[PDB]
RNA sequence: AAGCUCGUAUCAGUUUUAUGAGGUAAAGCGAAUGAUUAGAGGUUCCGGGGUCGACCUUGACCUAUUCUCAAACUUUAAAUAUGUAAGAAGUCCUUGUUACUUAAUUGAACGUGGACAUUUGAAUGAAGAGCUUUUAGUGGGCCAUUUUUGGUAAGC
RNA sequence: GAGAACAGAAAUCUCCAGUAGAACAAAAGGGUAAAAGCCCCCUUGAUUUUGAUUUUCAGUGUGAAUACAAACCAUGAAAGU
RNA sequence: GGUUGCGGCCAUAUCUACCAGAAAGCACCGUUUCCCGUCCGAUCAACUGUAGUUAAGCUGGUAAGAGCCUGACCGAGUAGUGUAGUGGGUGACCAUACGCGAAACUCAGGUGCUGCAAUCU
């Protein structure tokens, strides 16, 4: 730019933590989650990591280790088709889905699945998973927003209300869900229970069916050729509920070929580094070209 | 009138006659300044592990 | 509706910044003659 | 060669710099709502200048930001006013550009003498796809060397379409 | 007037290192301290709360308490002729984990494993350390290295 | 006034420069550190002579001044006005203090005194290490006799011992004259203002090419 | 001064090894800051005037160089001095207590029962180690080498 | 730095650059960049109780400070503070 | 091996330029009813994955590149410094003895390593 930086600048510049430069981590907040009580010693702290890619929803149960962070067990939106949703991968009801998947998935890993049931048939009303009298206590997990901007009725808090509703202790307040009115100041479980099962996406299809066919042609084009209807949506997620709680156990992809086999090909497209004899020979040649005062 | 102000002269000397001692430590140090609800619960952990030997010996 | 947009400046001085003064001015400009 | 990098208009801010408080400011604020239909935002005074009769923190100017469809025609409205001829300045070296015209009557906008008379500033910023790379929250990046709208590149865009002209040199 | 307040003279001392500033990383918060731990004390300027007085900078002591954000450390300072017992309540950003004792454990443990070698064989133990020694007789080969003989250099000015 | 140079001759105090915490100090009686022909090309003035301190002490600007003036006025008027480049190699940054008991009429005081002794700035001097060069002169090799005496004539304004040293080096640079000329055939010397720039091997290959063409005539 | 409890328990104006901490000396300024001599290159086509019905000076900035500096500058950084450890109050195995703590027989302390001595876990020294009570005088100090402030300096 | 009616050195608007070269009452030094800065939202932990610890130190007082306990509150989705 | 979610150390990871990028992922991007946030669906929100795309973000390579990391009887046993003498010198200073010992310089090499999870010719 002819803003070119003086060596004095680039010599004294202090480079941030790498995961700041690439902007994947707010460490100010990470300190305020990871760090545990010192009279609680080595008993780790667990965060619920909720990350939305464009095409996927990531939900991970994570504790921290100085070698690197640990994840108990993880789920995805892209797992949900196995539980019966081909379309609508990233949306609130799919966040409740993935959130309730990892709720009954991880909590099963602990042997805590049977005891500490959940909220069962879902009124969408505000409650948390309380404690069993003379028994274990809920496995405590904390919400990790990541870089995500907090708003009332945000895609992340579905995974919150999904996972909280699946037996996990993930404390919160209702007010950032849909149905908290910023005057009323209490919650309406309808607007939530609607959203929980997809009661927005479906309602748009109806209204959109009226206004524009050509808009409905593409936007929902996946629902058309798959034989899916408007209020069928309510039972797509209500079914996957039973399906999730049925088989929370994690089966991975069988991933055709293998580890070694991938690598043999999967990057032949990276360049090799030179040696010093290579770079020095080029330099001496790059002189010969540019030489002769040209 | 004016006179001396300060010095450390000869003080190392005086403090090495009888001096410099040592922390004089014991086993089972005092608990001064330890978390109260540790030293509270710690009482009953010992109050209870007493009866355990008020039974075993018979 | 009066909506004001806030300044990101940390400067709380009422002093005009020393980019401005009788100097740095110019004897030129289209002073209207008509 | 040039699949995704074509162009667009990022935003156009019409700015009306009053220089005084009260009516002339508050009236010029109605002008910009009758202009874009968007409700505008006034600016406080940076610092006191007793020559211009304004204490600091005195509400002075006003403007509004418009994008997409509504801007391009209000931009097209202005290009009719200066008659599709612009100078070698008016185009920033960062690729963006802008001009100004008096009276605001010249593009639509009937009189309404119960408003009064105002001119304005037309400045408009050019961008490309992948612009939110810089403007987002997560993983904020920086537009590469290619892309990165240049001065002669948004000129060859503004001369080709709009069939306009460079001037003054 | 003389000025003796708490942090006086600490200017360079409490400075963060050249090109190390801002937030403190997570290894500091992720460390566990129980009683008896031997810790080195070095203050951190970024954290003002619960930091040592400038005296204890560089001193090493045994933690006598573990609280929410801090550990009490008992340290021995001399006043007059004696050492009194100081105990500081310091946060974890100002606490290191002392490598002084750490090797002694790796010494004892290696000593017990070399004891089993005198149990399974019966050779002499040689457990306790011995300082460096006079070395020994040797023979230096003139083969391929023949002493090259030097003299002193004269005086000449280099500027 | 100017109490004699015998009072300030030795470096008795930590350097006390003109600064923010010390202001209102006089100006160095020597403002001119470079004179003669200061634009002369490097290759023009091969031979160099130094005036080197043999002592660890303080040189006052006023003394530096008269030394400078002395050297020049002889050097020029004998050999030539442009026959040399004289550089004063030391800058008087140390600020001397006086107490100044003398105040105003009619009487001195009793008995205070030493009380409030700290001084106001008096003069400037340049604190000098053993073997530190004071003056440097570069000229043509044929001027030696005239240059060697020029500095020799200026020592008498300098407190302490100082030697006149024949510099084995080219001009005001490094590189003893053969090791200079060695890099002159390779054209590694680009004349700068009254100095040279040297061609590195350390930089970007583009500008290294443009900068020193005849070095790769080729390589 | 009086002793008292004990008999090599524990030490130590010292080193060795392991492990900390520090920002002085030195050093650095074509590294930040602040100061500081000299030319050379490049835009203002000028901040301002001229030469002419746009070319030269003046400055202002900019680029790579050049001479010299800092108790209250500094990337770097000693020597000397300095905190800690070198065991039986050790290193481990097991599993009882609690109202603290945990998703939890998770922990945390504190115990029960059990594994290992022979260089028992650097050198050197120990004229013995620990403890207590009481009470005199003193509370103008000065000198040498070295580091060091004020002062031209002083048997200051 | 490059760009816009009057608008000029100085008004308001834009983009690019920008390791802190700004700001944090004040002395100075330290510390801070998705903040400790600017701005907005909500509050009264500038509260109750009573001990311990650091500096100064005689290891008295006083001033100031640190880490807890026991309550009762604020804030936030929360962990937290 | 690439790729992503959370990372540890926090430039061998930063800057500047220029190229290369299959698979998958990431993005860029389409959408403006609903929760939601703005002067402005730009950022924030929600819907869709459908209409389009590697141009960019991103990952690599290239540079007698900047900076940064590393090494050495490179400079230097130099500067400084601990101990010593009824050593030298009018002094300023300096030598020697028993030890400790730099920074600049220079040559040389290097340009992220890696944890848990998932995923892909
Ligand atoms: N060179 C002589 C120096 O002066 C010393 O003595 C000085 C003074 O003590 C003595 O008295 C002088 C007096 O002679 C002279 N004519 C008048 C002067 N006021 C006096 O001095 C007196 O007054 C001065 C100033 O107020 C003060 O120093 C003090 O009150 C007192 N000494 O005379 C000397 C100066 O005039 C000693 N003679 C000698 O040891 C010293 O080296
Ligand atoms: N020679 C090694 C070096 O010198 C030291 O190592 C050791 C000794 O040289 C050093 O001795 C020092 C002495 O210099 C100086 N007198 C300070 C200190 N009191 C002594 O150290 C010892 O002091 C007494 C016993 O004398 C003990 O109470 C104390 O705990 C101990 N550290 O004690 C160190 C530990 O025993 C430094 N730790 C370090 O520079 C380095 O290790
Ligand atoms: N750090 C490793 C060591 O670096 C040493 O080298 C040191 C110097 O040679 C090197 O100096 C380089 C210089 O070589 C190069 N040609 C220019 C560069 N600006 C300098 O850099 C250095 O000095 C500047 C100030 O001049 C500082 O701003 C900078 O932080 C510093 N790294 O800085 C190094 C220290 O950072 C030795 N090569 C060797 O002992 C070892 O490799
Ligand atoms: N001599 C040229 C003129 O003098 C001054 O500038 C001179 C210097 O101040 C400046 O020197 C360098 C500069 O080259 C470089 N690119 C940046 C650097 N910070 C400057 O540093 C300067 O100032 C700092 C304190 O801030 C000093 O420590 C340093 O010794 C001094 N050279 O470059 C000039 C030549 O050395 C005026 N600022 C300006 O009018 C003009 O450059
Ligand atoms: N370095 C080893 C030391 O062993 C010591 O151990 C010593 C004592 O603890 C132990 O004493 C025991 C005692 O515990 C127990 N309650 C009573 C029993 N009679 C004592 O026994 C001892 O003393 C008696 C009486 O004089 C002697 O007859 C007998 O020989 C001796 N073993 O006897 C040991 C001496 O022989 C300490 N644990 C400690 O100082 C250190 O670890
Ligand atoms: N809180 C009640 C107490 O619990 C104690 O047990 C708790 C711990 O103390 C006990 O841990 C023991 C520990 O006591 C003992 N001193 C050392 C042993 N390695 C530990 O074992 C621990 O680690 C091993 C793997 O290393 C695990 O398999 C095991 O589950 C775990 N408890 O395991 C329990 C939970 O961690 C004892 N049963 C007893 O002192 C008492 O009942
Ligand atoms: N101004 C007169 C005097 O100057 C002296 O200055 C001396 C100091 O500045 C410096 O002396 C240093 C000393 O500071 C440091 N602590 C120890 C070091 N060995 C000495 O070194 C000096 O003296 C020794 C003596 O044999 C010489 O061998 C050595 O070459 C010389 N540099 O060098 C000077 C002596 O050579 C003293 N400051 C003091 O006696 C008095 O002020
Ligand atoms: Mg946050
Ligand atoms: Mg239980
Ligand atoms: Mg609340
Ligand atoms: Mg509440
Ligand atoms: Mg008196
Ligand atoms: Mg006296
Ligand atoms: Mg007295
Ligand atoms: Mg006094
Ligand atoms: Mg006694
Ligand atoms: Mg003071
Ligand atoms: Mg430091
Ligand atoms: Mg350091
Ligand atoms: Mg505070
Ligand atoms: Mg004198
Ligand atoms: Mg003095
Ligand atoms: Mg001066
Ligand atoms: Mg005074
Ligand atoms: Mg020196
Ligand atoms: Mg002389
Ligand atoms: Mg060390
Ligand atoms: Mg310093
Ligand atoms: Mg200091
Ligand atoms: Mg110095
Ligand atoms: Mg240096
Ligand atoms: Mg600075
Ligand atoms: Mg500053
Ligand atoms: Mg010039
Ligand atoms: Mg180094
Ligand atoms: Mg038990
Ligand atoms: Mg003995
Ligand atoms: Mg007495
Ligand atoms: Mg008395
Ligand atoms: Mg008396
Ligand atoms: Mg005396
Ligand atoms: Mg006397
Ligand atoms: Mg005498
Ligand atoms: Mg800048
Ligand atoms: Mg700066
Ligand atoms: Mg504040
Ligand atoms: Mg300040
Ligand atoms: Mg600062
Ligand atoms: Mg930073
Ligand atoms: Mg809480
Ligand atoms: Mg969009
Ligand atoms: Mg979005
Ligand atoms: Mg590409
Ligand atoms: Mg390089
Ligand atoms: Mg390496
Ligand atoms: Mg002598
Ligand atoms: Mg020596
Ligand atoms: Mg030593
Ligand atoms: Mg060494
Ligand atoms: Mg890199």
How would DSSP label each residue in F108-162?
--SS--SSS-PPEEEEEEEEE-TT-EEEEEEE-GGGHHHHHHHHHHHGGGSSS-E
- Ligand 1 test: best mutation among F105, F106, F111, most atoms within 8 Å of CB? F111
Please name every residue paired with A63 in a beta bridge, in sequence order, or none if there are none: A46, A70
Long-range CB contacts (within 8 A, 24+) of E17-20: E19/A12, E19/A13, E19/A14, E20/A14
Q: Residue written as tokens 């443009």?
A: F210
Residue E151, φ and ψ in degrees, nearest 5:
-120, 175
Written as one string, the DSSP assignment of D52-92 is TTB-TT-EEEEEEEE-HHHHHHHHHHHHHHTTTB--SSSB-
By CB neighbour count within 10 A (0-12 exposed, 13-18 middle, 19+ buried), where does E130 fall? Answer: exposed
Residue with tokens 């991933």: A255
The three-state secondary structure class of D45 is: coil
Which residues from the 211-240 window of protein chain A have CB within 7 angstroms of nucleic acid chain I?
218-223
| Distance CA E68 to C1' H80 in A | 12
Q: Is the dihedral of CA F199, F203, F209, F210 positive or negative?
A: negative
**Structure-block tokens of residue A1:** 């730019």
What is residue A83's DSSP assignment?
G
User: Could you tell me whether strands A142-144 and A46-52 are parallel, antiparallel, or unpaired per DSSP bridges?
Assistant: parallel
Q: How far apart are CA E45 and CA E11, in angstroms?
A: 10
Peptide bond preceding A125 in cis form (omega within 30 of 0): no
CA distance D66 to D72: 9
CB atoms within 10 A of CB A250: 15
> Tokens at residue A14, please?
């202090």
A1 touches strand I (CB under 7 A): yes
Helix (H) or strand (E) holding F78: helix F61-78
CA–CA gap between residue A196 and residue A164 (Å, rounded): 13
Nearest to F55 by CA among F156, F125, F150, F127: F127
Q: CA D35, CA D62: separation in Å to the nearest integer?
A: 13
Which residues touch A243 (CB under 8 Å, ≥6 apart)? A83, A84
- By three-state DSSP, how is residue F34 classified? strand
For D122, residues 6+ apart whose C-beta sits below 8 A from its C-beta are: D12, D14, D75, D78, D98, D99, D100, D101
Strand stretches in chain E, DSSP E = 38-40, 60-66, 70-78, 83-91
Phi/psi class of residue E49: alpha, beta or left (left: φ > 0; alpha: ψ in -120 to 50)?
Answer: beta
What is the token pair recorded at F205?
């290959």
Contact call for residues F63 and F128 (beta carbons, < 8 A): no
Gaps in chain F following residue numbers (C to N > 2.5 A) = none
* Distance of alpha carbon A103 from alpha carbon A248, whole angstroms: 9
- ∠ CA A236-A241-A243, nearest 5°, is 90
Count of CB atoms situated within 10 Å of the CB of A154: 19
DSSP A175: G
Which of D144, D146, D142, D145 has the alpha carbon at shortest distance from D132? Answer: D142
CB F30 within 8 A of CB F88: yes
Taking chain E, what is the end-to-end CA distance rounded to the nearest angstrom? 51
Q: How far apart are CA D169 and CA E5, in angstroms?
A: 69
- What's the rounded Cα separation, in Å, for the pair D70 and A273? 52
Q: Is A43 exposed, middle or buried (0-12, 13-18, 19+ CB in 10 A)?
A: exposed
Against chain B, the chains showing at least 3 CB pairs within 8 Å are E
The phi and psi torsions of E99 (rounded to 5 degrees) equal -85, 5
Distance CA A71, CA F20 (A): 58
- The helix, strand and coil proportions of chain E, stated in percent and rounded to the nearest 5, come to 20, 20, 60
Nearest 10 degrees: Cα torsion F73, F77, F81, F82: -100
Distance, in Å, from the CA atom of A205 to the CA atom of A216, rounded to the nearest integer, reads: 7
With tokens 């004259």, the residue in question is F177
Residue closest to F79 by CA, chosen among F145, F29, F34: F145
CA angle A173, A177, A183 (to 5 degrees): 85
Rounded to 10°, the helix A201-211/A232-246 angle is: 160
Interchain pair F169, E157: CB under 8 A: no
Among A84, A15, A26, A106, which residue's Cα sits nearest to residue A237? Answer: A84
8 Å CB contact of C5 and D48: no
Report how far apart, in Å, the C-alpha atoms of D87 and of each of C31, D99, D123, D166 are. Answer: 22, 9, 14, 5
**Are F201 and F215 within 8 A, CB to CB?**
no
With b for 16 or more beta-carbon neighbours within 10 A and e for fewer, the F26-48 pattern comes to eebbbeebebbbeebebeebbbb
Considering CB atoms only, which of E65, E82, E87 is closest to B21? E82
Task: Decide if A63 contacts A70 (C-beta within 8 A).
Answer: yes
- Determine contact, residues D122/D35, Cβ cutoff 8 Å: no
- Ligand 1 binding pocket, CB closer than 6 Å: F 108, 110-111
Cα dihedral D57→D58→D60→D62 (10° resolution): 50
In the 8-state DSSP scheme, what is residue F215? Answer: G
List of chain A residues whose C-beta atoms are within 8 Å of the C-beta of residue D139: 22-24
| CB F47 within 8 Å of CB F180 | no
Helix (H, G, I), strand (E, B), or coil: what is residue A58? Answer: strand
Q: How far is it, in rounded angstroms, from Cα A161 to Cα A143?
A: 11
Q: Which of D158, D156, D11, D15 is nearest to D85 (CA)?
A: D158
Q: CB within 8 A of E135, min separation 6: which ones?
A: none
Instruction: Yes or no: say if F208 and F200 are a contact pair by the CB < 8 Å rule.
Output: yes
Residue indicated by tokens 């009490």: E72
Task: Give the pair of three-digit tokens for residue D5.
Answer: 């990098």
Whether E75 and E86 have beta carbons less than 8 Å apart is answered as yes
Helix extents (H) in A226-275: 232-246, 259-266
Please give the Cα distance from D12 to D17 (Å, whole number): 16
Q: Which residues pair with D93 in a beta bridge?
A: none
Contact at CB, E33 and A12, closer than 8 angstroms: no
**Beta strands A57-63 and A70-76, pairing class:** antiparallel
Contact A92, A110 (CB under 8 A): no
- Distance (Å, rounded) from C-alpha F170 to C-alpha A234? 93
The span from the CA of D95 to the CA of A109, in Å, is: 57
CA distances from D58 to C2, C4, D53, D116, D155 (A): 13, 11, 10, 21, 38
**Sheet with E38-40, side-by-side order of all strands:** E38-40, E60-66, E70-78, E83-91
As given in the structure block, the two tokens for residue E155 are 């005086």
**Buried b / exposed e along E112-128 (16+ C-beta atoms within 10 A):** eeeeeeeeeeeeeeeee
Tokens of D38: 């968007």
Nearest CA to ligand 1 atom 30: F110
A50 φ/ψ angles, rounded to the nearest 5 degrees: -120, 115
H or E segment and range at residue F47: strand F47-53
Structure tokens at F10: 């030795």
Tokens, residue D126:
């050019």
| Centre of ligand 55 from the C-alpha of residue D146, in Å | 35
From CA A138, how far away is CA A130, in angstroms rounded? 7
Ligand found nearest the CA of F8: 21
Which among A16, A20, A22, A52 is the top mutation candidate for probing chain D, defined by the most D β-carbons within 10 Å of its own β-carbon? A22
Alpha helices in chain A (DSSP H): 7-12, 18-21, 27-34, 92-109, 155-164, 189-196, 201-211, 213-219, 221-225, 232-246, 259-266, 276-290
Phi, then psi, of A109 in degrees rounded to 5:
-55, -30
Asked whether the CA dihedral C5, C6, C11, C15 is positive or negative, the reply is positive
Beta bridge partners of F36: F85
Interatomic CA distance for residues A75 and A71, integer angstroms: 11
d(CA B4, CA A290): 80
Phi-psi sector, A54: left (phi>0), alpha (psi -120 to 50), beta = alpha
Residue of D149, D133, D140 lying closest to D8 (CA atoms): D149
Enter the tokens of residue A291: 């030489």
β pairing state of D120-121 and D100-101:
antiparallel
Distance in angstroms (rounded) separating the CA atoms of residues A144 and A49: 5
Token code pair at residue B47: 């109050």
Of E137, E45, E152, E153, whose CA–CA distance to E91 is shortest?
A: E45
Bridge-based pairing state of the strands F162-167 and F133-139: unpaired
Contact check, Cβ <8 Å, B22/E83: yes
Q: How many CB atoms lie within 10 A of CB A198?
A: 24
When scoring E20, E32, E46, E92 by the number of chain A Cβ atoms within 10 A, the one with the most, hence best to mutate, is: E32
Q: CB-based contacts of A271: which residues, under 8 Å, 6+ apart? A: none
Q: Taking CB atoms and an 8 Å cutoff, what residues of chain E touch F52?
A: 159
What are the counts of helices (DSSP H) followed by strands (DSSP E) for chain B? 2, 0
What's the resolution in A?
3.3
Phi, psi of A86 (to 5 degrees): -85, -35
User: What is residue A127's three-state secondary structure?
Assistant: coil
Q: Are A37 and A45 in contact (CB under 8 A)?
A: no
Q: What CA–CA distance (Å, rounded) separates A48 from A148?
A: 13
A196 Cβ partners below 8 Å, 6+ apart?
Answer: A92, A93, A96, A122, A124, A158, A161, A237
Task: Quote the CA–CA distance of B34 and B2 in Å, as a whole number.
Answer: 51
Closest alpha carbon to F150 in F63, F95, F73: F73
Q: State yes or no: cis peptide before A96, omega within 30 of 0.
A: no
Whole-angstrom distance, CA of residue A217 vs CA of residue F154: 100
**How many whole angstroms separate alpha carbon F7 and alpha carbon E139?**
64
The F120-128 sheet, strands edge to edge: F57-60, F120-128, F94-98
d(CA F67, CA F156): 8
- Quick check: bond before A83 cis, omega within 30? no
The answer to whether the CB atoms of A286 and F216 lie below 8 A apart is no
Handedness of CA F151, F157, F159, F160 (dihedral sign): positive
- Which contiguous run of DSSP H or E holds residue B50? helix B36-56
Q: Quick check: helix, strand or coil at residue C9?
A: coil
Please report the DSSP string for E94-158 in residue order. GB---HHHHHHHHHHHHHHHHHHHHHTT------S--------------TT--PPP---------
Alpha-carbon distance of F175 to F169, in angstroms, equals: 6
Q: Please compute, for residue F33, the number of CA atoms within 13 A of its CA located in the half-sphere on the CB side.
A: 8
Cβ atoms D143, D128 nearer than 8 A? yes
The count of C-alpha atoms lying within 13 angstroms of the C-alpha of D72, restricted to the half-sphere facing its C-beta, is 10
**Structure token digits, residue D22:** 């009260």
Structure tokens of D112? 């309404």
Rounded-to-10 torsion of CA F105, F107, F108, F111: -140
Among F73, F60, F174, F29, CA closest to F127 = F60
For residues D67 and D71, give the distance between their C-alpha atoms in angstroms, rounded to a whole number: 5
Report the distance separating Cα F2 and Cα F122, nearest Å.
Answer: 8
Measured distance CA(E110)–CA(D116) in Å, rounded: 94
Task: Using DSSP, state whether F97 is helix, strand or coil.
Answer: strand
Q: Hey, CA dihedral for E54, E55, E59, E64, is it positive or negative?
A: negative
**Bridge partner residues of F84 (DSSP):** F139
| Residue A119 Cα to chain centre, angstroms | 22
């Amino acid at each position: 730019q002819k803003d070119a930086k003086s060596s004095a600048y680039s010599s004294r510049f202090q480079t941030p933590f790498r995961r700041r430069r690439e902007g994947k981590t707010d460490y100010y907040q990470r300190k305020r989650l990871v760090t545990q009580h010192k009279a609680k010693y080595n008993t780790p702290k667990y965060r619920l990591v909720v990350r939305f890619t464009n095409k996927d929803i990531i939900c991970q149960i994570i504790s921290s280790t100085i070698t690197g962070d640990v994840v108990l067990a993880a789920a995805y939106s892209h797992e949900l088709p196995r539980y019966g949703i081909t379309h609508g991968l990233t949306n609130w009801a799919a966040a409740y889905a993935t959130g309730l998947l990892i709720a009954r998935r991880t909590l099963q890993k602990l042997g805590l699945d049977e005891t500490y049931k959940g909220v069962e048939e879902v009124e969408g009303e505000y409650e948390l998973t309380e404690a069993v009298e003379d028994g274990p206590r809920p496995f405590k997990v904390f919400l990790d927003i990541g870089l995500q901007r907090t708003t009332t009725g945000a895609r992340v808090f579905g995974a919150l209300k999904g996972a909280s509703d699946g037996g996990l202790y993930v404390p919160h307040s209702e007010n950032r869900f849909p149905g908290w009115d910023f005057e009323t100041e209490e919650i309406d479980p309808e607007l939530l229970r609607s959203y929980i099962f997809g009661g927005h996406v479906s309602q748009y299809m109806e209204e959109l069916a009226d206004d524009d066919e050509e808009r409905f042609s593409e936007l929902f084009k996946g629902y058309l050729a798959d034989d899916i209807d408007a209020d069928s949506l309510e039972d797509i997620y209500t079914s996957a509920h039973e399906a999730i709680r049925a088989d929370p156990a994690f089966k991975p992809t069988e991933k055709k070929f293998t580890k070694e086999q991938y690598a043999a090909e999967s990057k032949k497209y990276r360049q090799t580094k030179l040696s010093k004899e290579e770079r020095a020979a080029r330099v001496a040649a790059k002189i010969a070209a540019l030489a002769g005062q040209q | 009138a004016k006179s001396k102000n300060h010095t450390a002269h000869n003080q190392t000397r005086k403090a090495h006659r009888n001096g410099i001692k040592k922390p004089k430590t014991y086993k089972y140090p005092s608990l001064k300044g330890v978390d109260p609800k540790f030293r509270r619960n710690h009482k009953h952990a010992l109050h209870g592990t007493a009866k355990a030997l008020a039974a075993a010996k018979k | 509706k009066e909506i004001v947009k806030s300044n990101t400046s940390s400067k709380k001085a009422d002093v005009p910044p020393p980019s401005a003064d009788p100097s740095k001015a110019r004897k030129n400009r289209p002073r209207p003659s008509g | 060669q040039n699949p995704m990098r074509d162009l667009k208009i990022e935003k156009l801010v019409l700015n009306i710099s009053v220089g005084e408080s009260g009516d002339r400011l508050t009236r010029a604020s109605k002008v910009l709502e009758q202009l874009s239909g968007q409700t505008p935002v006034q600016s406080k005074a940076r610092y006191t200048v007793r020559t211009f009769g304004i204490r600091r923190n005195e509400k002075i100017a006003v403007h509004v930001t418009v994008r997409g469809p509504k801007a391009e025609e209000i931009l097209e409205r202005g290009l009719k006013v200066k008659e599709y001829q612009l100078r070698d300045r008016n185009f920033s070296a960062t690729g963006n550009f802008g001009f100004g015209i008096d009276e605001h009557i010249d593009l639509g906008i009937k009189y309404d003498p119960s408003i009064g008379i105002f001119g304005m500033d037309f400045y408009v910023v050019m961008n490309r796809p992948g612009a939110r790379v810089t403007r987002r929250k997560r993983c904020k990046g920086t537009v590469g060397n290619s892309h990165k709208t240049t001065k002669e590149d948004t000129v060859s865009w503004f001369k080709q379409k709009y069939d306009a002209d460079v001037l003054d040199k | 007037g003389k000025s003796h307040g708490y942090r006086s003279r600490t200017r360079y001392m409490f400075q963060r290192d050249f090109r190390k500033h801002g937030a403190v990383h997570l290894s500091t918060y992720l460390k566990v301290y129980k009683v008896g731990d031997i810790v080195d004390i070095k203050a951190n300027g970024s954290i003002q709360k619960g930091m040592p007085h400038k005296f204890y900078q560089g001193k090493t002591g045994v933690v006598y308490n573990v609280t929410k954000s801090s550990v009490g450390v008992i340290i021995n300072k001399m006043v007059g002729n004696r050492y009194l017992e100081k105990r500081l309540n310091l946060r974890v950003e100002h606490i290191k984990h002392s490598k002084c004792r750490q090797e002694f454990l790796e010494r004892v443990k290696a000593n017990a494993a070399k004891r089993a070698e005198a149990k399974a064989q019966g050779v002499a133990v040689q457990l306790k350390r011995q300082p460096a020694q006079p070395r020994e007789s040797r023979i230096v080969s003139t083969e391929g290295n023949v002493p090259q003989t030097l003299a002193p250099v004269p005086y000449e000015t280099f500027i | 006034a100017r109490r004699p140079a015998r009072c300030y001759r030795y470096q008795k105090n930590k350097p006390y420069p003109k600064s923010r915490y010390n202001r209102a100090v006089p100006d160095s009686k020597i403002r001119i550190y470079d004179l003669g022909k200061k634009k002369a090309t490097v290759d023009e003035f091969p031979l160099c002579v130094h005036l080197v301190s043999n002592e660890l002490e303080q040189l006052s600007s006023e003394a530096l001044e008269a030394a400078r003036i002395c050297a020049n006025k002889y050097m020029t008027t004998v050999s030539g006005r442009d026959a040399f480049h004289l550089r004063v190699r030391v800058h008087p940054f140390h600020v001397l203090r006086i107490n100044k008991m003398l105040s105003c009429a009619g009487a001195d005081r009793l008995q205070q005194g030493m009380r409030g002794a700290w001084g106001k700035p008096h003069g400037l001097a340049a604190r000098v290490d053993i073997g530190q060069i004071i003056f440097s002169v570069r000229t043509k090799d044929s001027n030696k006799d005239v240059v060697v005496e020029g500095l020799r004539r200026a020592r008498y304004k300098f407190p302490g011992q100082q030697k006149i040293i024949l510099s084995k080096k080219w001009g005001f640079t490094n590189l003893d004259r053969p090791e200079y000329l060695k890099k002159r055939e390779a054209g590694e010397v680009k004349d700068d203002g009254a100095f040279v720039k040297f061609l590195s091997k350390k930089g970007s290959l583009e500008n290294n090419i443009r900068e020193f063409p005849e070095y790769f005539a080729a390589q």
